[PDB]
């Protein structure tokens, strides 16, 4: 979307005082802080071709997107109990462990 934050997400808009959207950019900040970390679908369809999906690879694709869900991933997600899996994925794992794993997925692509 943008690089900064001054003015807020929606400037001049009323806000109330979905949590995935915040943790997504948190993992993004961590990945940014690991610096050494048409070729889109070539790398993207490479990330999911072996058919052994994991939540780390989903995260690794957005670090190509914010930087298909139906026609490939949707069945795996509903077999995971919905997005209760991805938020639980950040849960039973270190901030650092999750970040290092997702970096690995990008390193090998």
């Amino acid at each position, epitope marked *: 979307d*943008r690089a*900064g934050r*001054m003015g807020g997400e929606a400037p*001049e808009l009323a806000l109330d005082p979905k949590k995935l959207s915040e943790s997504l950019k948190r993992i993004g900040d961590e990945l940014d802080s690991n610096m050494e970390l048409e070729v889109f679908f070539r790398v993207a369809a490479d990330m999911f071709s072996d058919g052994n999906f994991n939540w780390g690879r989903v995260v690794a694709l957005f670090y190509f997107a914010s930087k298909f869900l139906r026609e490939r991933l949707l069945g795996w997600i509903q077999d995971q109990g919905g997005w209760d899996g991805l938020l639980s994925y950040f849960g039973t794992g270190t901030w650092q462990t999750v970040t290092i794993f997702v970096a690995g997925v990008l390193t090998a692509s």
Partner: antibody
Amino acid sequence: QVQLQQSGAELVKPGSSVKISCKASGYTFTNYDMHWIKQRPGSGLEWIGWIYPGNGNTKYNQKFNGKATLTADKSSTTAYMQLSSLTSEDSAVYFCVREGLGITFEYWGQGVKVTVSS
Amino acid sequence: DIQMTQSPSFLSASVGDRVTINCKASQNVNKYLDWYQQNLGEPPKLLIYHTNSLPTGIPSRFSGSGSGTDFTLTISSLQVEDVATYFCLQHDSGLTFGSGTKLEIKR
């Protein structure tokens, strides 16, 4: 050293337009939002808008929707502000300013004084 | 947009004085309030960001505090080079500057 170097025409007739440039150097241009600021007496300091050079996304202060157009070229690491349909009220100093990472308006252009007159 | 009321508009002080400038927001802006210093012919200079953080190279006699609606910039011991105009800036929702405080030397 981060440097923001501005250039633009300083004397324009009412009703014409003007293009202000802001050449960035010393950092990766597409990693930071660039904002634009107006300063003139009576009216004070005003935020015009920002552009993110990473994708050309912009956001404008309502008061400046239509008066100002912000663009960025990654290749020349330069941001631009076009101001159209100038009147005397647009006589001001215009700044480009970089928004930092974990910090705000640390580096500024030197400013461009725009004078609208016949 | 959020309104910034900055006061006083004009402040007289001597070298060695502790100076404070106030800024009031018309609604809560959290910690997202900065202070800038400007000399004639120059762009503003960041002095304090996010209520109380010091940028690199800014002398430690500058500090800030705030509640989210009421904010202060303090200079612990004024120096000659601190004579200038000072502006607050909220950036929680949109961006709004205060109208400025001109700081002069007393004699």
